Amino acid sequence: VCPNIIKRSAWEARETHCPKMNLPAKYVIIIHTAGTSCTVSTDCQTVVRNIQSFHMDTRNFCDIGYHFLVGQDGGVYEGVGWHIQGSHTYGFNDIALGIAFIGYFVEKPPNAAALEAAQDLIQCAVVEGYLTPNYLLMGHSDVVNILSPGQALYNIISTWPHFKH
Ligand code: NI
Ligand code: NI
């Protein structure tokens, strides 16, 4: 079953109304926040709240771009959640679930807790039906031209099942 998923009300998400997406998502994109990292709940919460505002205010997104985020606390934060579109990858925001690891992982990778959480969340995703049984996993930089999710992180995920080798 899905990990603890700390809801939007927890980190005080500015509430909005964004374009819902047809849930049988066919892909999974692993992206990294590229910004600061967090190790305790209260810190991750603040970072998530700020990524949303930035995304809405200066990026002009409808809400935070990611469906879910993962902190070094091993906690899984709801982004826009399952039922909403994302603003994370071009032409995939309505068909790919974007999971953002909070922090910067080009050299060093997320800890084992952060990683275990993503895979557990991905699993229930396929199990619950939010992901097609034959969905395809891939890195952010595999679809668009971006320095994400970082070598370290990339090398780990390329290891996971259904990864688009
Ligand atoms: Ni599970
Ligand atoms: Ni474990």
Side-chain angles (χ1 to χ4, degrees), residues 27-92:
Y27 308 80
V28 171
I29 312 289
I30 303 307
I31 93 91
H32 77 152
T33 256
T36 188
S37 193
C38 60
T39 67
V40 303
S41 68
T42 60
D43 287 341
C44 295
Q45 279 161 283
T46 306
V47 172
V48 183
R49 203 210 317 125
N50 290 329
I51 291 179
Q52 181 194 52
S53 297
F54 179 71
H55 278 190
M56 307 183 84
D57 289 354
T58 99
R59 308 293 298 169
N60 291 324
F61 288 165
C62 184
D63 205 308
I64 192 165
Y66 325 110
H67 297 271
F68 298 92
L69 291 114
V70 181
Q72 294 291 269
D73 57 345
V76 169
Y77 300 71
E78 176 172 56
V80 296
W82 312 96
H83 318 286
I84 301 302
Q85 211 126 306
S87 300
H88 60 69
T89 308
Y90 186 67
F92 274 96

Side-chain angles (χ1 to χ4, degrees), residues 66-148:
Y66 325 110
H67 297 271
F68 298 92
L69 291 114
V70 181
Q72 294 291 269
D73 57 345
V76 169
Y77 300 71
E78 176 172 56
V80 296
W82 312 96
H83 318 286
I84 301 302
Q85 211 126 306
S87 300
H88 60 69
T89 308
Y90 186 67
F92 274 96
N93 292 307
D94 65 311
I95 207 50
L97 293 177
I99 305 175
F101 280 72
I102 303 176
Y104 178 90
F105 315 105
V106 310
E107 294 173 1
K108 215 60 185 179
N111 57 54
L115 289 171
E116 285 179 358
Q119 308 197 82
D120 197 23
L121 168 60
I122 292 173
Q123 185 172 52
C124 79
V126 198
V127 180
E128 292 290 302
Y130 296 108
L131 264 180
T132 55
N134 68 339
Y135 73 89
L136 264 168
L137 175 92
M138 51 191 80
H140 211 179
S141 68
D142 268 9
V143 190
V144 301
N145 179 52
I146 182 171
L147 211 314
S148 181

